């Protein structure tokens, strides 16, 4: 079909310091060399419309960095990303203030998200109905519990209509009754032929939601393709890893971290 | 040329959003106080009181200036200082404090310091209305010359805003900036006609000539001309007007250029 | 055996305000009456040594309030709690500062928890080994990822040796390899015949870990007893609730919230 | 009697913890600065410079006091003021800011404002050593009388600490307290011998007699007696010593009583 997201040679580097003298010397001297850490390294993948892609890998692999670079909140050191369409991110807790009440927080967050005044006025009652807070919609958010804060954040955030959606480790929130509502909303979102990027550790959710898999290891793209051809490979690697000794796991992690650090 | 156009368009298209966010900030700041937003007037008033006992009662032995009682001279001269001080001190910190809440959203980033300034402009307007009302008890009633405020109250705002547009970027790249302004602003308080008037024709004459290079000089003197002296200020001091307009334009241009040059990498420095 | 925790007639009330004038008038006038919200209401239960008790209920029920009152961070309006032994709480993110490095954060958090200097010096290397950060132990915590922050917090926090333990919705953190380590630690904790309070929504984890169930509904203690006699009842209630209409659920929630509010 | 005993025991048993937490706070505050902890000395120094140009050069036309150059008089008199100002202003906010991090842990809660004060006492000690070294260039060398500092530097610390022990509790119950101190501290700066000396024998005589009820009077005058005048201060002013000791005791007693009365319900007000 049509390419919606196109990532070409994206690289992300960071500079590692030990004392303030090192930081100042690097800031001043143009030639000064220091250690450099490669968070990402030469990532290339093409996404199509209607593709649901799940990102998999161990801690520190670099999937939040990639989803921030796709989301637009972070910029590559090298390479480029071409987006066809508008991009949105599910970050439920971002715009909530404990000093404000729930009704005020709806307007505050919808304003920060980019909505116009008439749309905010029109869609406030539906959000209030969805969140199911009741009377506590008239109270400061600092008097809430954790589940109610999550429910309000999710209800405000799910009102977007983008072309590209990014979800980072939150598919459903609340108790057993709210989770079904959240899952139904996400499945409706998938039904409309929208491109979705999804980061998770729940492999059952990945199997029942995604259609493509992106395997990230050591800041690199290990593999990329259909779910039924790639997910079994990652699962086999995972099951093999649990069967090594502690020294073998330490050696594997040290070898992985060796290639990510370079003096330059 | 493109940076100026981008920042100008972003500010012009979002007037309502700037006002709304400033109001939400005012609500957030005073949330747990028993009195509420009343402190937005109570804190500036008390500071004036102290400044009257030290510099009016102690020094000067309560001596009038230019045929006016010293209390009203000081009152009209100091009304805009708290707005300038607070606006700059918090606009320097605005982006560092508020980038992460809107980074994932598509937001006009150049308006972040401006609404922080507007939240202080509200209290300035309240205090200025109170000062004009208080000046009527001595016998100083509004004249036609008061219309000059329509040029002078806006200009002050613009000046403050322009400065923050630079010092918000500088404060992200180098944090030590936040410690420098505290020392600079103090110099701008005492070397200004807010509390005292230089003698001129002497060793104080050079100090007066250097003081004329402070924009606070023009702001305070223009306010006093409109409210107290019943004079058209620009009929004798249009060169100072041109100098201050040039200053505001220079600050805005440099701030816009730097902001559009570095805004895409703000996550590195934060 | 011996009663370890004894809760008698614990009640928790909150005062609800709409404008600042109401708040000031209540502060000044001694007789002024206002709305009052009952977060808890006449809770009584006896806990024994070696009991693992799981707290269950829907959002807003009052289990975090009860676990804070048991933990000692909150005080009852009426009634009293008698503890036999020292009490600890698993709050992994509490003492972490993004400005400090990992090594500094270990000492900072262990100092705030109440340890002495010699113990901190002795147990730092084991914590460093457990967290498995590697070189990033020498970097500020604000340069970490989410999984690494959780791993460091858990590794610092699991070093306590209390008589009563309180866990609020965190049994394991990290990827698939760290979760087994966390579960083994928690099972070892259970093996030593320690009293554990556990708050969760995962009913499989509750079935495989706890031995008693405390059902909280509308700020009240609906039931309390053995796992195999009480958990099926809550599961039956939950399965019945999903089969009602939206109006029936709204009516149930409104009826529940009616009894919690009283003017006095 | 029990509240005093509890607070005293909690402070005595945790000397090392107080020092360590103060050091961690100093590290946290200056994390992103290029210069680092050097600002802990740079900020107080610059503020002195301005105060020399306004009150020494402008007013007074650089006139000596009591046979000493004005610069060293002011330098010795102002060295402890920044510590007092900052210590009180942040000790009033300490519990509100830091209760939630230690609430779940079993922690001595009365030591929270004290380590916030200690983090400023460090910079005070550095500045005082610099001032004593700088006084040697004019020809004022240390004498035996300098040993008096062993009573006077501690007392200052205690005074500040006692005040915070009250104003930390008051700041949790009523937030508006945080806005009042800003106005009170200013009054305590100008009505003190830090910048000027009252005339006495006149209308200024009553002001001098009222000024003697300020503890800052005793602090500055005792420091100057030990460093500049080569005099045993207590041989003429032991009544002021007793008055200030009584003040510190009263503040400590009231603060301990209120803190132990309300500490169990701090989560309600926060
Ligand atoms: C008390 C005083 C103490 C000392 C004061 C500070 C001394 C200077 C410090 C330098 C400093 C402050 C700004 C300085 C100028 C601002 C004022 C301007 C005038 C004001 C009236 C920025 O310095 C600027 O860095 C820019 C980099 O964007 C660079 O931009 C352009 O350059 C060319 C055209 O200039 C142009 O061709 C080029 O395309 C541009 O990039 C600028 O040239 C350079 O001046 C901050 O240091 C920065 O730290 C950053 C990590 O936080 C770091 O970026 C990251 O890059 C990689 C990507 O991940 C990765 O490796 C790391 O993440 C990290 O390395 C920067 O490299 C480093 O520099
Ligand atoms: C610009 C100025 C604006 C106005 C200024 C403020 C006006 C006064 C406001 C009163 C105020 C400030 C402290 C006042 C004195 C402090 C200075 C002392 C002297 C200083 C030199 C506290 O007031 C104090 O409240 C104490 C309650 O602990 C009470 O303590 C003792 O009383 C008896 C012995 O006094 C003794 O028998 C008794 O056992 C003690 O309880 C005190 O008597 C009373 O004075 C704050 O208001 C408080 O808000 C709290 C919710 O945050 C609220 O507690 C909660 O209680 C329930 C439990 O969940 C639940 O219903 C709610 O959660 C809530 O209701 C308090 O009820 C309310 O009062
Ligand atoms: C008067 C004064 C000089 C002047 C001074 O002391 N000087 C300088 C050279 C000549 C003359 C002298 O030789 O004494 C000063 O510098 O600061 C002051 C501060 C910081 C002051 O804060 C408060 C007062 C004050 C307030 C009310 C009343 Cl009713 C009375 C007082 C006050 C006076 C002075
Ligand atoms: C001198 C002065 C009076 C005194 C004054 O103006 N008075 C009061 C009654 C008599 C006399 C007068 O009638 O003019 C004052 O009040 O504030 C001042 C402020 C706030 C000042 O900040 C800076 C200076 C200053 C600094 C350096 C140099 Cl080299 C020169 C100046 C400075 C002077 C005065
Ligand atoms: N500012 C930074 N400076 C240096 N390294 C960083 C910085 N931010 C992130 N990293 C490192 O970049 C790597 C990738 O981090 P992330 O992408 O956030 O983690 P992740 O792959 O999503 O895995 P999780 O979230 O822990 S399961 C890790 O080694 C981080 O420590
Ligand atoms: N400060 C407060 N003032 C008023 N009501 C409060 C306050 N804190 C909590 N509540 C209410 O007390 C009730 C119990 O809250 P919690 O015990 O925190 O929630 P919960 O039972 O743990 O359920 P979760 O965590 O959302 S699954 C809820 O209705 C809260 O809104
Ligand atoms: Mg992550
Ligand atoms: Mg909870």
TrEMBL record, chains B, D:
Keywords, in A-Z order: Cell membrane, Membrane, Transmembrane, Transmembrane helix, Transport
Q: Does the keyword Transmembrane apply?
A: yes
Q: How does it sit in the membrane?
A: Multi-pass membrane protein
InterPro entries listed in its UniProt record = ABC2_TM (IPR013525), ABC2_TM_bact-type (IPR047817)
Pfam families tied to this protein: ABC2_membrane
| GO biological process, alphabetically ordered | lipopolysaccharide transport
Family, per the entry? Belongs to the ABC-2 integral membrane protein family.
This one is known as Transport permease protein
- Source species of the chain: Staphylococcus aureus (strain USA300)
Lineage from the top down? Bacteria, Bacillati, Bacillota, Bacilli, Bacillales
